[PDB]
Structures are given as C-alpha cells and as structure tokens.
Amino acid sequence: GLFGAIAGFIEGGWQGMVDGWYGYHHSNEQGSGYAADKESTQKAIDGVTNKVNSIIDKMNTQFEAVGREFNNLERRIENLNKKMEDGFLDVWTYNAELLVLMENERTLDFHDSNVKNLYDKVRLQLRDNAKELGNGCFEFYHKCDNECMESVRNGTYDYPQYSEEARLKREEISG
C-alpha cells in the first residue's frame, strides 16, 4: 500500500477480529484474544459511508422526458438528438468508471493509513518498555496484565509505572 502497513509489515488480516476494522491482539498469562479499537473503526466507517453518500447525493436529478418524436423528414434533428444522448452517455460512463477507480484506490490507502497510525500511537505509548518485532507486534519488557493492555487501548498506559522493571529486564537482556 501507500503507507507500507496493510500489505507491508503487517502481513495478513485477522479472521479472528470481527468487532471492527482495526484493532489489537494480546497474548499474556491470563490467555490471549482479539479486541477492536472502537474509535478508529468508527472514524473509518463514518468517513467511508460519508464518501459513498457524497458520491450518491451530490448528483443533481431533474425531470426529463425522452423521447423519439421526429418524423422521417426530420432525421437531421433526430441525428442531433442522437449526438446529444450519445455524448452524455459517453461523459457519464467515463466519469463514473474513473471516479470508482480513483476513490477505491484512495479507500484502500485510507485503511492503510489508519492501521499505520494505530501502530504509531501504540508505539509511542510504550517507547522503551517493549521490543518492536516488525510484525506489528510488541514484546513487553515487563509484565502487562489485562488492566495494563486495557490502559494501552484506552491510551492510558502508565509508562513510569513500568519503566524501571523494563530497564532492568532490558539490561538483563543486554548481554
């Protein structure tokens, strides 16, 4: 993708995650599991829905009636009407097709960006309290129970609460 996330460093989607579009997976001593990031999912859904609705609603539709009312001594006018209809059909077809292609690409890239930003928010949240695996997975330098992960998804991970145990495990690992 454009943001290297979705078919880049995260290699695969989660059949397991159904609650939302983007989210988190944990495996700790209490067990494992998926949980969706509600907010970002809502932003993405509301946004994409807004896009579809804007493609649909921006269309102006007035009343028109057509329409074959010229006789066979009025075929030049008939031809003028045909050039008009065919012209409008060509315009609308081209524009509709290209609109679909362009906005589809942007949609996929939008999802990409959303996942990437989620990864970045968590990343900055834990800092040196964990190891980046590259998968989009973080390995904790401390013990992060369920309330702790709760705090990460909340965005309330208390870094100083664990900084020290992390430095200790880290230098324990250091050589």
Partner 1 sequence: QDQICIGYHANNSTEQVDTIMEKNVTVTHAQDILEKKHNGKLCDLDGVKPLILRDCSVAGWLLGNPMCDEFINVPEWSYIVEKANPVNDLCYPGDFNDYEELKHLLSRINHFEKIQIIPKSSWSSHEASLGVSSACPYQGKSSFFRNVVWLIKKDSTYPTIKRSYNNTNQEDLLVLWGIHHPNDAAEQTKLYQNPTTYISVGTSTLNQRLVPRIATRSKVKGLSGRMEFFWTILKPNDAINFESNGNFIAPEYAYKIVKKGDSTIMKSELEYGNCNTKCQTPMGAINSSMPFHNIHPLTIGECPKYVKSNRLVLAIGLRNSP
CA distance 101 to 110: 14
Angle (nearest 5°) at CA 162 between 24 and 133: 45
Q: Which of 28, 34, 35, 125 binds a second copy (CB under 8 A)?
A: 125
**Under a CB-based contact definition with an 8 Å cutoff, are residues 19 and 26 in contact?**
no
Tokens representing 121 are 């928010």
Q: Which of 11, 16, 52, 92 binds a second copy (CB under 8 A)?
A: 92
We find the least distance from the C-beta atom of residue 161 to a second copy, in angstroms, to be 15
Tell whether residue 45 is a contact of a second copy (CB under 8 A): no
Q: How far is the CB of 30 from a second copy (least distance, A)?
A: 27
Pick from 136, 163, 157: which is nearest to 145 by CA? 157
Residue 151 near a second copy by CB under 8 A: no
113 neighbors 3 (Cβ within 8 angstroms): yes
Of 34 and 70, CB closest to a second copy: 70
Position 48 contacts a second copy (CB under 8 A): no
Which token pair is 70?
A: 């010229």
Nearer to a second copy, 31 or 175 (CB): 175
Q: In the bound complex, what is the minimum distance in angstroms from residue 72's beta carbon to partner 1?
A: 8
- Whichever of 28 and 81 has its CB closer to a second copy, that residue is 81
Question: Interaction with a second copy in 156-175: which residues (CB under 8 A)?
Answer: 164, 167-168, 171, 174-175
Is position 108 an interface residue for a second copy (rule: CB under 8 A)?
no
- Judged by beta carbon distances under 5 to 8 A according to partner kind, the member of partner 1, a second copy, none in contact with residue 35 is none
How many CA atoms does the CB half-sphere of 142 hold within 13 Å? 21
Residue 155 backbone class (left: φ over 0; alpha: ψ -120 to 50; beta: rest): left
